[PDB]
């Protein structure tokens, strides 16, 4: 009875999505001229990790960037001069995510230890020590992002997300509803709402203040590994293990466009956007990072040069450079 | 060209590089072992023998060789996503209990826990990330298994076994079935040892299997394999 009601309601929502769509996005955006071949040359090569890098995050000053490695190290890098600024030894070697604060005071990290470590960088003593440890997730942490210097949203492998208060140490808001492991999360520029994708081939848009699921986007065939908001904040691209990428609009509430090609069958580790948003950058398991034209679903460039599986990719706030991290322990900056 | 602060920053970067190289060498000498099995296998007991939420890390030093053992049993999450982290592992120590076949989980569909352990070992062995990784197989509760095979025949759980009731024959048959679960015999050794209440005998077998793995890695590094 309740299941039949759910089937009826989802059929009505599917009919509303069908009736709402009138013109294909590719047909409308076919008029604009193509950008052409975009070639990005390596500027800097970062070395000394000596282990499998999993996560990088750009700072808001567009110069410093944090990186997380499997040897138990967070390395904070000066990207212009190639010098290392900080080297934080970690209590647990197994790490899967790291966040750099917008102010630059704090660095978060997390992984298979079910603990989120917050490190203060502006201490008077001069040694980066453990400031605050978040604790209470029943699954492995997959992503963390600093909304503010006191509040942080983390996603975990117990199908849950949480909004934590750093000074208190307790979790304030708990987001539940996903049936699969939530693999990533992305913050909109306003920071009022955030979308997160899970291993049930769905993404969900959660309002922070409300604490309830604002929207739900389905359409993928496999586990969603990456998610990223557009600069305007009304759209977000998702990457999944089914060798396809998708673009979802919040207001339209339907699949705008699909990025895929026949030769590539491997998954999408990470996705990001440029400052304009015209170019969608995504690293795949084929040892490459492909730059797609977002408005025409065509490939604009290929970034080859990593010798192992590319794990993470990040565009800086001004958009001057793109830094990719791969499993060969080399961080490469492409301009 | 560079200012004094820039030169001091370069000197700081060189000191950090020296510390990272020293830490990388110290981590490179360490032998990593991944511990797997069911909850009822007896992981805690054998870890306490070898010593004397998330990842449980055990540090011990045998014959001037450092071992770090990673117990992943606490996590309830899907294994497929976080299993790729353990790609660079020397060996997987997989522990199961011989007495599991009589024990049955409280489910509407009566299922043998031994077949669940067989499915778990088949899933770990046929994993794409673990093709050249050796498995050290530990069979637990030998005395209770002997008392049980004396008290109850092994024919009841699966009809395929027609051997006469014998502890040695039943143990050999379980061992050869576990070895037959392997689908790539040439590139993956399976070391089967019956667990006993002796601290020396287990750790020495683990040391011998790790020594064989280091021999294999050194021969691959030199280029013979």
């Amino acid at each position, epitope marked *: 009875q309740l299941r039949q009601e759910a089937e009826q309601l989802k059929n009505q929502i599917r009919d509303a999505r069908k009736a709402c769509a009138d013109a294909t996005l590719s047909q409308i955006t076919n008029n604009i001229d193509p950008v052409g071949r975009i070639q990005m040359r390596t500027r800097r090569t970062l070395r000394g990790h000596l282990a499998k890098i999993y996560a990088m995050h750009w700072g808001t000053d567009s*110069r*410093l960037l944090v990186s997380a490695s499997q040897d138990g190290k967070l390395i904070i890098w*000066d990207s212009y*001069t190639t*010098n290392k*600024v*900080h080297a934080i030894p970690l209590r647990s070697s197994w790490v899967m995510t790291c966040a750099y604060a917008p102010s*630059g005071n704090y660095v978060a990290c997390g992984g298979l230890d079910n603990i989120c470590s917050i490190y203060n960088l*502006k201490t*008077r*003593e*001069g*040694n980066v020590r453990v400031s605050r440890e978040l604790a209470g997730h029943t699954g492995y942490l997959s992503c963390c992002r600093f909304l503010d210097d006191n509040q942080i949203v983390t996603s975990s492998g117990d199908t849950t997300c949480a909004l934590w208060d750093i000074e208190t140490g307790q979790q304030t808001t708990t987001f539940t509803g996903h049936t699969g492991d939530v693999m990533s999360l992305s913050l909109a520029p306003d920071t009022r709402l955030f979308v997160s994708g899970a291993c049930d081939a769905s993404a969900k848009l959660w309002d922070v203040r409300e604490g309830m699921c604002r929207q739900t986007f389905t359409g993928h065939e496999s586990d969603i590994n990456a998610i990223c908001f557009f600069p305007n904040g009304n759209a977000f691209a998702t990457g999944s293990d089914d060798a396809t990428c998708r673009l979802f609009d919040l207001r339209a509430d339907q699949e705008l466009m699909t990025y895929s090609h026949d030769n590539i069958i491997c998954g999408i580790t990470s996705v990001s956007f440029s400052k304009s948003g015209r170019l969608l950058l995504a690293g795949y398991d084929d040892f490459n990072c492909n730059v797609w034209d977002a408005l025409k679903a065509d490939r604009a460039g290929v970034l080859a040069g990593h010798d192992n599986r590319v794990s993470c990719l990040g565009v800086t706030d001004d958009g001057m450079a793109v830094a990719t991290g791969s499993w060969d322990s080399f961080l490469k900056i492409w301009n | 060209t560079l*200012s*004094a*602060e*820039d*030169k*001091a*920053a370069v*000197e*700081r970067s*060189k*000191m950090i590089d020296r510390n990272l190289r020293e830490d990388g060498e110290k981590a490179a000498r360490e032998v990593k072992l991944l511990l797997l099995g069911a909850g009822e296998s007896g992981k805690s007991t054998i870890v306490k023998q070898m010593k004397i939420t998330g990842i449980v890390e055990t540090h011990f030093t045998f014959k001037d060789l450092h071992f770090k053992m990673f117990d992943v049993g606490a996590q309830r999450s899907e294994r497929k996503k976080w299993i790729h982290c353990f790609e660079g592992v020397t060996a997987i120590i997989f522990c199961v209990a011989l007495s599991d076949y009589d024990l049955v989980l409280a489910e509407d569909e009566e299922m043998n826990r031994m077949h669940e352990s067989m499915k778990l070992f088949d899933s770990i062995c046929n994993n794409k990330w673990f093709t050249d990784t050796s498995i050290i197989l530990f069979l637990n509760k030998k005395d209770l298994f002997e008392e049980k095979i004396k008290k109850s025949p092994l024919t009841i759980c699966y009809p395929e076994y027609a051997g006469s009731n014998t502890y040695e024959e039943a143990a050999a048959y379980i061992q050869c079935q576990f070895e037959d679960l392997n689908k790539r015999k040439d590139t993956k050794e399976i070391y089967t040892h019956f667990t006993c209440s002796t601290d020396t005998k287990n750790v020495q077998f683990v040391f011998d299997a790790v020594t064989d793995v280091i021999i294999k890695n050194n021969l691959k590094d030199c280029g013979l394999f």
Partner: single-chain antibody, 233 residues
Framework: VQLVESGGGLVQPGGSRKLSCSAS????????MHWVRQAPEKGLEWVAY????????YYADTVKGRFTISRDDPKNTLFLQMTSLRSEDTAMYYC??????????????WGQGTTLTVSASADIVMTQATSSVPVTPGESVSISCRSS???????????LYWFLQRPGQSPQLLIY???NLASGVPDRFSGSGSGTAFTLTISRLEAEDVGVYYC?????????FGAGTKLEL
């Protein structure tokens, strides 16, 4: 964070003396150390620098040879060896910790000072044009500094630091790199200007700000200080 110096007292000329500065409550091994001297009725003067890990060592040209600087990291002690002292060395010596990276605030913490009395590339000249300005509490105060060489480096940083020494207390850092305020300094102070012409503006003058203001270049060794603008009421 605390630095205390020992080894003071009167010294005969031509003798030798070994000062020791002990550090507490911070990672001594990661900070570079500066020795700064101050005459009784004159301005400050830089003596020496040792990097963290003892990789590079710098001296002023007037103190080259006679003064030896060392450090012991397991005991967290900075050692200064002085041989063949002269009549110009009757000064108070301060120890300074300084860390150098992108976004760091060097010269932030100053020692307490040990008194020693003895009884019988072009050097960038920093010019304090004025010597004393009588001020009233409440008005905005302007202090001017000038250089002999353009401190604007090609990376965009201008290596000018503003220090305040209160009467009878250790000097504190106010401004590093002419724009950024040091941690713990109120927003009353602001630095502005360009190459060869720098200005410190104190809007809403408040008590305990009376002291001597120093402008320091940090473009190249040896470090040269200013004369020191003193305020009064």
């Amino acid at each position: 964070v605390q630095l205390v110096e020992s080894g003071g007292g009167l010294v005969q000329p031509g003798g030798s003396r070994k000062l020791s500065c002990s550090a507490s409550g911070f990672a001594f091994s990661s900070f570079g150390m500066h020795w700064v001297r101050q005459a009784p009725e004159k301005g400050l003067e830089w003596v020496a620098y040792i990097s963290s890990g003892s990789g590079t060592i710098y001296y002023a040209d007037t103190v080259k040879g006679r003064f030896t600087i060392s450090r012991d990291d397991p005991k967290n002690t900075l050692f200064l060896q002085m041989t063949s002292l002269r009549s110009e060395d009757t000064a108070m010596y301060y120890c300074v910790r300084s860390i150098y990276y992108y976004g760091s605030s060097p010269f932030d913490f100053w020692g307490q000072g040990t008194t020693l009395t003895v009884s019988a590339s072009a050097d960038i000249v920093m010019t304090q044009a004025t010597s004393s300005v009588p001020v009233t509490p409440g008005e905005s105060v302007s202090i001017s500094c000038r250089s002999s060489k353009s401190l604007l480096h090609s990376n965009g940083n201008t290596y000018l630091y503003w220090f305040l020494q209160r009467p009878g207390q250790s000097p504190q850092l106010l401004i590093y790199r002419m724009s950024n305020l040091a941690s713990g300094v109120p927003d009353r102070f602001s630095g502005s200007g360009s190459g060869t012409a720098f200005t410190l503006t104190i809007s809403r003058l408040e008590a305990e700000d009376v002291g001597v203001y120093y402008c320091m270049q940090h473009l190249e060794y040896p470090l040269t200080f200013g004369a020191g603008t003193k305020l009064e009421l």
